[PDB]
Amino acid sequence: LMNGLKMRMFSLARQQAPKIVHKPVLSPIPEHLRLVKNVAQVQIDMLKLLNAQAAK
Amino acid sequence: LIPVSLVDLININIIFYILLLYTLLLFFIPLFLASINYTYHYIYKYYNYNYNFINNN
């Protein structure tokens, strides 16, 4: 932007390698696995408590 | 006029044209069918079976 003018500036340079942009990918697999983890920990605590009761 | 002619009605030369044209069409059908649609990509990405578990307690 200038006084009485607007312009578009483009560079002139060869791009030797691609430009990377971190666009994070949404996926349900990590949350699937974390849900499996939580349910398994629930069952493990359950088994430990039941063993403590049955034996103590 | 020249194109007004019964000789040009059943012209064997144009029949050869049509023959070669559609034989080549038939030869190249499996290359015309070689366009990719991105619908099964969508189905793979978006089809999400219910991952919730059953918990009676």
Side-chain angles (χ1 to χ4, degrees):
Chain A
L1 297 159
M2 297 172 161
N3 185 70
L5 176 65
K6 177 190 170 296
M7 278 197 317
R8 260 189 298 159
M9 194 144 80
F10 315 82
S11 82
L12 301 174
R14 188 178 270 180
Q15 203 173 341
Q16 306 302 131
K19 203 191 167 289
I20 289 156
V21 186
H22 279 270
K23 278 179 213 315
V25 171
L26 179 64
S27 200
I29 289 151
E31 284 296 348
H32 281 143
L33 297 157
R34 286 192 211 101
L35 170 54
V36 169
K37 260 191 198 187
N38 306 135
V39 172
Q41 274 290 332
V42 163
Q43 285 285 306
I44 288 153
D45 300 344
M46 196 164 130
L47 286 186
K48 280 197 298 221
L49 174 58
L50 290 162
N51 181 25
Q53 195 202 0
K56 45 176 74 170
Chain B
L1 267 59
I2 287 163
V4 186
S5 48
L6 296 167
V7 170
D8 293 333
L9 178 54
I10 307 158
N11 205 346
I12 187 60
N13 215 16
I14 291 152
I15 285 160
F16 290 154
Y17 191 75
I18 289 150
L19 281 151
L20 269 67
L21 196 144
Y22 286 101
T23 52
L24 261 71
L25 196 147
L26 279 171
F27 185 72
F28 290 122
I29 288 172
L31 309 183
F32 299 138
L33 302 176
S35 314
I36 284 156
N37 313 136
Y38 292 86
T39 190
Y40 290 106
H41 302 76
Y42 200 90
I43 294 161
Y44 187 91
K45 192 166 147 180
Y46 287 75
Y47 174 40
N48 293 316
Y49 62 102
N50 196 307
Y51 59 90
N52 311 127
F53 288 107
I54 309 306
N55 296 297
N56 206 323
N57 307 125

